[PDB]
């Protein structure tokens, strides 16, 4: 669960490192976000050089939370991190490389361009 003023690492090649969450789009008083949910955020730390510069308001999708997800067959998955990928308003990564491993729920929510580039898809 990820709420207002949580901080996420970036699993992308876009020029951002840390991100601060501003909204949890979808609903009118919704509290938390999960794996496969879209978000509005601030860039807090960038990389010297990069398409995305610090201070920008931008959209991102969550992969890889600590309090993870639950599957219909009774099994669970959990990660050691919270991470997101910055998105281009029709679900495409604004970078070209995803880092680290990714949850399989991004298929059902139809981020198919992102499930092509992840190293591992769990």
């Amino acid at each position: 669960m990820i709420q207002q003023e949580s901080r996420l690492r970036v699993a992308d090649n876009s020029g951002a490192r840390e991100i601060l969450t501003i909204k949890v789009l979808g609903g009118s008083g919704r509290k938390t976000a999960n794996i496969g949910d879209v978000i509005v955020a601030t860039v807090k730390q960038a990389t010297p050089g990069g398409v995305v510069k610090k201070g920008e308001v931008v959209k991102a999708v969550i992969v890889r939370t600590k309090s993870g997800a639950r599957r219909a067959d009774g099994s669970y998955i959990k990660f050691d991190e919270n991470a997101a990928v910055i998105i281009r308003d029709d679900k495409s990564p604004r970078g070209t490389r995803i880092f680290g491993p990714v949850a399989r729920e991004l298929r059902e929510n139809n981020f198919m361009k992102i499930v092509s580039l992840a190293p591992e898809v769990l």
């Binding site: 890889r64 067959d73 009774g74 099994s75 669970y76 998955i77 959990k78 990660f79 050691d80 991190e81 880092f99 680290g100 491993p101 399989r104 190293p119 591992e120 769990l122």
Partner: protein
């Protein structure tokens, strides 16, 4: 208790090998990618086991591409096909929660024959 065990008895698996938390294991899961059926493998160290009956579960830790991953399974699902013990570890407790804050060489578990 005995009315519940009798109803749930006919659904326990009999091909489950013996292992402890501390041992390494290969789970032969089953994934469904559209219509296709397929089998993955998930290799790691068993760190938990909390039990009594059909309600038994266990969990496996792995480090994939620089990030640590944990996956819990019920013991008797038909959606697993195989649990193989690869190594045996020397351990001193039941919950290895201290492994989730160590990395690399500090997270080493010694082997043992059985």
């Amino acid at each position: 208790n005995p009315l519940i065990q009798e109803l749930t008895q006919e659904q326990l698996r009999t091909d489950i090998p013996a292992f402890r938390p501390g041992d390494t294991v290969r789970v032969h899961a089953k994934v469904v990618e559209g219509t296709r059926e397929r089998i993955q493998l998930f290799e790691g160290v068993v760190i938990k086991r909390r039990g009594a009956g059909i309600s038994e579960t266990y969990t496996v830790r792995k480090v994939s591409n620089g990030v640590g991953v944990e996956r819990t399974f019920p013991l008797h699902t038909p959606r697993v096909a195989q649990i193989e013990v690869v190594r045996y570890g020397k351990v001193r407790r039941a919950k290895l929660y201290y492994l989730r804050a160590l990395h690399g060489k500090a997270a080493r578990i010694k082997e043992i024959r059985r």
